[PDB]
Design a protein around this ligand. Sequence first.
Ligand code: HEM
Ligand code: HEM
Ligand code: HEM
Ligand code: HEM
Ligand SMILES: O=C(N[C@@H](Cn1ccnc1)c1ccc(-c2ccc(F)cc2)cc1F)c1ccc(-c2nnc(-c3ccccc3)o2)cc1
Ligand SMILES: O=C(N[C@@H](Cn1ccnc1)c1ccc(-c2ccc(F)cc2)cc1F)c1ccc(-c2nnc(-c3ccccc3)o2)cc1
Lengths: 442, 442, 442, 442
Amino acid sequence: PPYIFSPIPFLGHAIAFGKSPIEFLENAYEKYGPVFSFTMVGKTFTYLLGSDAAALLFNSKNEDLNAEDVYSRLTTPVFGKGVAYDVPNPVFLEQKKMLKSGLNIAHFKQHVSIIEKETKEYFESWGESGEKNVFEALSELIILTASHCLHGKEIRSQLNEKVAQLYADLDGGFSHAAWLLPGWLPLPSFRRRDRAHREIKDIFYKAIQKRRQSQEKIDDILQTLLDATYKDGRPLTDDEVAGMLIGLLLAGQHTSSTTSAWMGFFLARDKTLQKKCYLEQKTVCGENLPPLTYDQLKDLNLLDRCIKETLRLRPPIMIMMRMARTPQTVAGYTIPPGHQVCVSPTVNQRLKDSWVERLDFNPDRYLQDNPASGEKFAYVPFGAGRHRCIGENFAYVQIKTIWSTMLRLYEFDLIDGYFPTVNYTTMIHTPENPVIRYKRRS
Amino acid sequence: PPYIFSPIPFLGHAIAFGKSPIEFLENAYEKYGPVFSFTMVGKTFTYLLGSDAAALLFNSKNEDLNAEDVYSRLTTPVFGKGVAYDVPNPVFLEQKKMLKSGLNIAHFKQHVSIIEKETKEYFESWGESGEKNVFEALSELIILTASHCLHGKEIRSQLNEKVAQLYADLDGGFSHAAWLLPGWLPLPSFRRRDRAHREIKDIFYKAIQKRRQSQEKIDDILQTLLDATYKDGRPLTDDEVAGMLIGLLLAGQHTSSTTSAWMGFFLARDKTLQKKCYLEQKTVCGENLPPLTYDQLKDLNLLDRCIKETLRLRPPIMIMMRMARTPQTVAGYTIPPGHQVCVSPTVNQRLKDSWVERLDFNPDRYLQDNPASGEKFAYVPFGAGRHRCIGENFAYVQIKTIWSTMLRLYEFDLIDGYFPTVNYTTMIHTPENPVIRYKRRS
Amino acid sequence: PPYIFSPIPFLGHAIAFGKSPIEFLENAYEKYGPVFSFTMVGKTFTYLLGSDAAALLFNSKNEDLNAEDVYSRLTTPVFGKGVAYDVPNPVFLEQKKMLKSGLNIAHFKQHVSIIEKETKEYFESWGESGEKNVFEALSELIILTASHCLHGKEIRSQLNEKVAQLYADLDGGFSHAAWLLPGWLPLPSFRRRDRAHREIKDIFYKAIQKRRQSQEKIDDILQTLLDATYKDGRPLTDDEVAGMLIGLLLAGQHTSSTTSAWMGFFLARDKTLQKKCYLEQKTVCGENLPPLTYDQLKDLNLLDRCIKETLRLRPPIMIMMRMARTPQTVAGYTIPPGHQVCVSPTVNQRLKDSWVERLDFNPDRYLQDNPASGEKFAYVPFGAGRHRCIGENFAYVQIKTIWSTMLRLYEFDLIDGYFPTVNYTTMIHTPENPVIRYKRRS
Amino acid sequence: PPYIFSPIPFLGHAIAFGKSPIEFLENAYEKYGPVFSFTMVGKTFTYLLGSDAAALLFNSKNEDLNAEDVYSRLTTPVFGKGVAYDVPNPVFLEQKKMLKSGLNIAHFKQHVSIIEKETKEYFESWGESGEKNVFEALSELIILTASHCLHGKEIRSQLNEKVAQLYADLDGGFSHAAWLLPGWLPLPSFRRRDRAHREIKDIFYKAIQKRRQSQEKIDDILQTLLDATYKDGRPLTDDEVAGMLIGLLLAGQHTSSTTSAWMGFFLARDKTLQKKCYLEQKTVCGENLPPLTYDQLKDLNLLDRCIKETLRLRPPIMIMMRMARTPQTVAGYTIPPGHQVCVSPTVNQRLKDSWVERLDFNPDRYLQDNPASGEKFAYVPFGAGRHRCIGENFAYVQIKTIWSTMLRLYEFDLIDGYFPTVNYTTMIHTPENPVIRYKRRS
Ligand code: HEM
Ligand code: HEM
Ligand code: HEM
Ligand code: HEM
Ligand SMILES: O=C(N[C@@H](Cn1ccnc1)c1ccc(-c2ccc(F)cc2)cc1F)c1ccc(-c2nnc(-c3ccccc3)o2)cc1
Ligand SMILES: O=C(N[C@@H](Cn1ccnc1)c1ccc(-c2ccc(F)cc2)cc1F)c1ccc(-c2nnc(-c3ccccc3)o2)cc1
């Protein structure tokens, strides 16, 4: 595959790529095509851009394009041993079926009123009007809603600011330092990550032992997990459950919070589209805006397309990476073992040749013919194939319910017309200076 | 000097020291005496503990024990060029005087009313009661109070969340990453630091030119700097002044916020003492508690001793360090060039030899024979000698005014008896989980 | 407990203790009594000498005096994950019961004829007379006998010089280097350990899979493991089984080889005794000396007492150690958490107070009153309590079968009256210059 | 010079280089050219690849590129005081001339018949055929031949298993632990080294005095040392002679044994070549293969080239290193003091640019134009300049004699076509699993 030369030793394209990766990759697509390699910080990466190329990653077996080889070093200290990329993929495929089994309609029905209430109670602190950081706000809110829904009421009631900070300490295990440096260096963020892991695990161990002795029946996701079994017939251990609960919260929080914050700003920019979203609430749920229900959520189809469009333009997982263990073919090229193969939903979901008015925020594009339905891997915010997301439905419930409630409470505006740029320096591309103006809804 | 061997290559005692640096130094004192050496992360350090040993550092000439050699590389990219450790010491000493001339009675009198107002207005958001993170609050207030007083009303008014983040980016330049790794690595913290430095220097350039061309006589710290002059007769360039303004704010924020936070918890744990600090407010300023004046602050003796005692047990600057350029002598040992010589106010200030009830918060210890007055270098939170603090006066005015105001507003308590342990992983040590219970002062 | 001062910082008494540990301990016993402490290498050790003091260690719960804390770091890379000190003690206790059920009379009956044949065949290479290193011979023979018996014929057949070297590479994981230095140094011994671990594991995985698939009923230790289940109901994984096989071989080899070597020299020195052992072979087994059977072993009483007395004077596991997790009281003292508590079989088994003619090799001492029967923890070559050995019976079958065969083959003598001194530079103390004179018996 | 950056603090490229040093250096050569630098375990190494660059090291004065500075620490405890890297280089140069005078034709003529006899006698144990470890056999054989030739018959008669172990203890002085850790630590290897040194010295002292007080005339290497003088007129002390005698054995053994073993396998792999070597024996010595003589060894040309080609592909001393004491210039670069400057015989002797079919074993490459005669430092298995070997002639006598003899006894083959890979974990690279098939020669 074509190789993009850089005269800068070791660093290669690091600076330019870090500054503007989408522009870097779109320029390369124009110049070298859908498949190309480059060096950055001592590693070779090979990209697959566009649906046809990306299909290799999305279709391939883990034995060929391996996820653990790239992610385990970073994730295993955060999520825990015996879970995710710390086990053989077939074990993780079973754990994912266990998790999926609890993300069902019965539970989603319960989650809606829990989330709505959590949201209304959080935003009382915003008062009738002002200008505040909506990203910080959603982050704090989403850690509460995710915990309430995915861990349950017992665990959620223990999530004070201390435990919230522990989760922030775990997050800090995902850094440039952790990627670049050996783990045996006693860096503060490493020690803080390991401390938080031990302390959260302990919180979960007690809660789990409590639940196991309890005589009561509780139909929640925790209970799905205590009841689950492998094809073996073997149940999950306390440590496996706890590892899974940590994963559920990290997965549940940052992908929803960034996406909810970008959509706030897309809707703040497009005031008519926001108005429409608010009017859809009256139409579907009634003029008197009663408590939200799951059945009503399915009927919020404009808000649905708005979320869908937010994920097109700002997918919170911007990249999917694998390690090539065996030789792989695409577009006539042969990628050898050792290349790290990458896909970028951001680049694919915005490619000129497939998306008309690619840079425009337009939810209604999905009511016409479009690459989301017309192609296989042009729209891939939740991935596809063996490593694909199991949380799309929950995420949509969480975000829909939060933004429905937020729309009912407030009208949102840009400050001096400013639309946030993308902060590329964070692992997750958050909107820069994400302060939003708000005032009471009519 | 006796060497504390570690068989661990490169790291040396890094892990044990990072976990509990104070306890590590106290144990070393008990086993090796007041002067000892060790390796940490590639480097040789020699400590001077106790008053008699520490004197070598405090009385030393910067030619012999050198500050720039150990600090320049980390500070120059934060504060700026031609300032602090980026210039020969004799030049920096003149800049300290320029700054000191501006930290005077007349200006302190203006600051009291300003700081008091900032404090009342910030703490409206807390309402009548609740449980909130006092450390975060004090950090947010103090950046305002420190800017209002040290920079001016004009620069202050421009201090929004965005610019406040710019300052945090600048704090982020003091990291292990920055200490360990080459500066040309495009790490996010490095870039943000360099970006934040240009954007702040620029906000200063604009206010520095506004003032020089204005006709209005304003008597403030900013003006003192603009008027000030070297022994040459040379005035300060815009960039010399701006860099000093940066230093001023970093010097004036977290030293006072951590300390202020700790005193909060010391007073929350000892209610009887808290009560007495409140009654002293009445007793000194009047039953009706009128606006504060600089004169009233000098008569707040119990409050003064609470601050002094907070600084004894939790000094924000845990270590002062120099590079030995010439052979030094102390307690019968000779320290060779290349060694880094260290003093710790924290250790000196709780040494078993010299402080009774050493770990107790007892502000009335200073009403009796004690090493603060009894010895020269046992109590040294603001250092001593050629490098000692010039902001001590302003720090007490800031902290006294805020906590006087805070005690008038609220009575503070612990949550479930918890006293914050020390977070050693932050540059300045911080209280862990520093959420405090508060309610309206009768 | 009384503390034994050393003026040598860091090392403390390590030199003297490395040279003459038994003498150090015996003199400390006389001077300080049965419980005392000292420092080496920044680590504080407390000894319990004599039956009454040792009782604390042997009787303690692992939650109080903990083996993992002191052994896990070295053993886990050797034996593998999920086994021995890498799991909570209760799981290891179940693992030990699985192993113990495999060490039964039906298997012992098979082992005697396996071991006799391996022994006759190995010693073909010794011819009619000569002078050779018995210790090397016993080590080479025992790795075959232990693998043949404990792993089975399939795995045994794959035990060539290459695999033997891999086991030596695993052994090399137990070193002063692995104890003293951190694991992230890429030392040759660590790399060879880790490679040997993967390569030995791989051999076991194939043999394990072979047997599961196979339809033939084989009654051997491997099969005991494949058929075993935890109280859980859960069977062992392939990796747990392989880990346990590695452990079986390492436990089965050096403990028997060193003891057998020592017994060789004790018998070479006391020719009258050696003759009596030879004649007991004729008396018990028959004048024509037919093949050994398991049932004759129990009637070989003199030989039994010879092994007992060799273990008395030369126990191959010369120390047992634990980390104190909770305060422990003995002899009026309180041992605090953090001390490593320590017993020596060697010292207990020769203490002047209880053993008459304590340094004499006198197998017949057990035919009158003696500390092994009259005291609880004076004779403890295989330990006692929760960490006690499961392999005593096997070791006696192995050693008796080998030495019965050797006595039938050869008469052994010393070389110019030399009796080997103890080599304290090896992990398990070996006899120095263990070359022995032999000639065809009768 | 270009620097190869590693983001791995301290360790630098330690792991990658230790895994595959030749591949590392050859890749570096391609990317950076003949001179480059990198960090490994806290040290800066600068390599000179190819003849023209390596010239700097081989042509350098010891005052500029110093050998004691890098080697002294490890070698002195092994060889003894007063010898080799423990004295200034001019003194060692004189000592080398003394050894040179001992390694003369009169002595070599004696050695051939000594070596042939030890060889025939040693391989008696091998029988008519089998599969045995040729590397271990050669190592054991060579310690005997080297000691018989270089120490004489008296000392050699005392070389039992015990003494051979003392020599292994000595070699054990050359460890990563001795490189990393202070000499005062009483580590096993340090203790065994120093004990072995004392005991071997005592064997040499008696033998030496035995000769000085004797009347017989013995023309052997010891006598040359005893009759030798410095320019001073000063003769060697007993400790100088004994130090040199240790050096002679350690240099004489492993360099020849590893090289001999590699050649076994090159010859077993290339049976046509092996047959030609056997036929050469008959051609030069005669059909009846009488006792070897020195004059015959000189005419065994094909065997000479097989050795030369073995040293080409597997030089036992893989690196030559010096401390830069003064700035040096090469390839338009300046190497500052403190850099460790290195040459790799293995890379030079394999370079893509110079050697056609670079990885082929082709002894006849030397009968055409080739870089061993066409360039100065492409072929340097024995070094060059002030530090070059004085043992090449003895080596060639020892190896030729042993293999001529082995070729007369046996034909050799690979086992299942396995060619030993390189074991990079040993000080001297060794062949992995060096068991070889052999059968009585026609
Ligand atoms: C808007 C919300 C979310 C987005 C955009 C998102 C995105 C993704 C993507 C792109 C992948 C594929 C990763 C890859 O191919 O390497 C993925 C996998 C996954 N996600 Fe999500 N996700 C979301 C929410 C959630 C939630 C709520 C959960 C759990 C409740 C979750 C759990 C997972 C899991 C378990 C995987 C599987 C990873 C693997 O098998 O390697 N996600 N997600
Ligand atoms: C509680 C508040 C503060 C504490 C505990 C504190 C402590 C110290 C200490 C210990 C030193 C000595 C550093 C050394 O010699 O290595 C010092 C120096 C200094 N402080 Fe502060 N300080 C505080 C507040 C301030 C403030 C508010 C300013 C300015 C407004 C300031 C400006 C300085 C300056 C300019 C130096 C001299 C640096 C040098 O000479 O190297 N400090 N401070
Ligand atoms: C002469 C031969 C042997 C001796 C002297 C010996 C000695 C010991 C001793 C003293 C302990 C207690 C360790 C402690 O408390 O820290 C022990 C434990 C043990 N031995 Fe042996 N042993 C021998 C042979 C074997 C054999 C043949 C096996 C297996 C077949 C074996 C397996 C074990 C196991 C599993 C433990 C348990 C360790 C623990 O629970 O922490 N041993 N042995
Ligand atoms: C195949 C066998 C041998 C090889 C490949 C070999 C290789 C070398 C090499 C490459 C050097 C240069 C060291 C440097 O420049 O850093 C050297 C030096 C030396 N060799 Fe050998 N050698 C061998 C056998 C011997 C023997 C048999 C002796 C003595 C009988 C010996 C004694 C020496 C001595 C004394 C030096 C001088 C070291 C110095 O001056 O720094 N070598 N050898
Ligand atoms: O090999 C170890 N223990 C042995 C003790 N043993 C042998 C026979 N009966 C008991 C061992 C323990 C458990 C097992 C084992 C356990 C479970 C199983 F299924 C199979 C085997 C096998 C063993 F060989 C071992 C080795 C070294 C150390 C060690 N810890 N610290 C050091 C140390 C300290 C200072 C300097 C050098 C080494 O060494 C601890 C344990
Ligand atoms: O044994 C060493 N050198 C050998 C090199 N040699 C062998 C044959 N021809 C030359 C050597 C050098 C001088 C002599 C010698 C000296 C004097 C004399 F009278 C006779 C012989 C003998 C030798 F064996 C030696 C070994 C190790 C090291 C060493 N330096 N660093 C390391 C090292 C570094 C990192 C990790 C581990 C080891 O190892 C340096 C020299």
